[PDB]
């Protein structure tokens, strides 16, 4: 099972601009690592994936809530 | 058909280090645009996708060959 050669990388280039209400986040996903600029990605109910600045405390709080329940 | 909110972006963080022989490139793909650092991606026969610095003339030449035949 040889690994690919050097595919691109799903890295966020920016972030939304409004906190997604908990009623709009059933899960999340983190970016890669290759790019020196990872970020947290929230999965909503009427969209797909949304990048979020890990610098905003609410982002860290929502991630913590996802780790619990 | 509402568009997602702000998904990540397949942007290359680096590039391979050896020119892929024409005998190893049946197609290619370009990165996105959101990230201020797009790149050309070559598709081989025994791998997947490979990012390439558009600064290397051979990359531009191989792309031209793909546009012709």
Give the Cα separation of B68 and B60 in Å (integer).
13
| Number of DSSP helices (H) and strands (E) in chain A, helices first | 1, 3
The radius of gyration computed from the CA coordinates of chain A, to the nearest angstrom, equals 14
**Class assignment of domain A1-69?**
mainly beta
Closest CA to A44 of A68, A69, A62: A62
**Structure determined by:** NMR
Cross-chain residue pair A5–B35, CB shorter than 8 Å: no
Domain segments of chain A as ranges: 1-69
Q: Measured between CB atoms, which of B2, B6, B12 is closest to A51?
A: B6
Cross-chain residue pair B50–A12, CB shorter than 8 Å: no
Chain breaks in chain A (C to N over 2.5 A) after: none
The burial of B40, by beta-carbon neighbours within 10 Å (0-12 exposed, 13-18 middle, 19 or more buried), is given as: buried
């Amino acid at each position: 099972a040889p690994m690919g050669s050097d595919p691109p990388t799903a890295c966020c280039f920016s972030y939304t601009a409004r906190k997604l209400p908990r009623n709009f986040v059933v899960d999340y996903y983190e970016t890669s690592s290759l790019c020196s600029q990872p970020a947290v990605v929230f999965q909503t109910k009427r969209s797909k994936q949304v990048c979020a600045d890990p610098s905003e405390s609410w982002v860290q709080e929502y991630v913590y809530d996802l780790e619990l329940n």
